Write a protein that binds this ligand. Structure first.
Ligand SMILES: CC(C)c1ccc(CN2CCC(O)CC2)cc1
Length: 171
C-alpha cells in the first residue's frame, strides 16, 4: 500500500498550534520548517517524479488583530498554478523510499520574477500538497496527498512574535 508520512510532524504541530506563517518575498524565501516526507509502497523498480503545490484553504483572507488570526476580507483571485518539481525527479521508487524526501529548496514568492518559485497571495492560508507522477505511464497515473499539519498563512512579514521566536528557536 502507498503511504506518504509527514516527517517532523511534532515540529509542524508546534507551529500549527500558533497558526503557522511563511514569509513570501520578491526573490523568494525557503520554508521553515521544510516539508519532508517518508514514502513506502511505491514499486521500487518504477520511475516517479515528485511535485509540490499549495492549495488555497479558504474562501477568505486572514488578518492578525489583537494577537488573533481572524477572517480579513474576500480572497484575491487564485495565485497562478505553480508546481515545484522535486530536483531528484525522475527517479526510481527505491530512491524515493530509501530516505526522507525533502523539498528544502522550494522558494515562496509574491512576485513572478522567475526560477522554480511558488507564487502565493499574502494573508491567504495554503495547504501543501505532494503529487507522485508515474513516468512513462500512458494513463499518466498521479497520486496526491495533502498535509494538514503543514497549513500556513503567507505573510510579507511575521505577524505573531511567537512565530518569529519559534523560527529563531528551531532554525
Ligand atoms: C524537537 C522537535 C520539535 C524538532 C526540533 C527540531 C528539528 C530539526 N529540524 C528543524 C527545521 C527543519 O526544517 C529541519 C530540522 C526537528 C524536530
Amino acid at each position: 500500500e502507498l503511504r506518504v508520512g509527514l516527517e517532523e510532524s511534532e515540529l509542524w504541530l508546534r507551529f500549527k498550534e500558533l497558526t503557522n506563517e511563511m514569509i513570501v518575498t520578491k526573490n523568494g524565501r525557503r520554508m521553515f520548517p521544510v516539508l519532508k516526507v517518508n514514502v513506502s509502497g511505491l514499486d521500487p523498480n518504477a520511475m516517479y517524479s515528485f511535485l509540490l503545490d499549495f492549495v488555497a484553504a479558504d474562501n477568505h483572507r486572514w488578518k492578525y488583530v489583537n494577537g488573533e488570526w481572524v477572517p480579513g476580507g474576500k480572497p484575491e483571485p487564485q495565485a497562478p498554478s505553480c508546481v515545484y518539481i522535486h530536483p531528484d525527479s525522475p527517479n526510481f521508487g527505491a530512491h524515493w523510499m530509501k530516505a526522507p524526501v525533502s523539498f528544502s529548496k522550494v522558494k515562496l514568492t509574491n512576485k513572478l520574477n522567475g526560477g522554480g518559485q511558488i507564487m502565493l497571495n499574502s494573508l491567504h492560508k495554503y495547504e501543501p500538497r505532494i503529487h507522485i507522477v508515474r513516468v512513462g505511464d500512458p494513463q499518466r497515473m498521479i497520486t496526491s496527498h495533502c498535509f494538514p499539519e503543514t497549513q500556513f498563512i503567507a505573510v510579507t512579514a511575521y505577524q505573531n512574535e511567537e512565530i518569529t521566536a519559534l523560527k529563531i528557536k528551531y532554525n
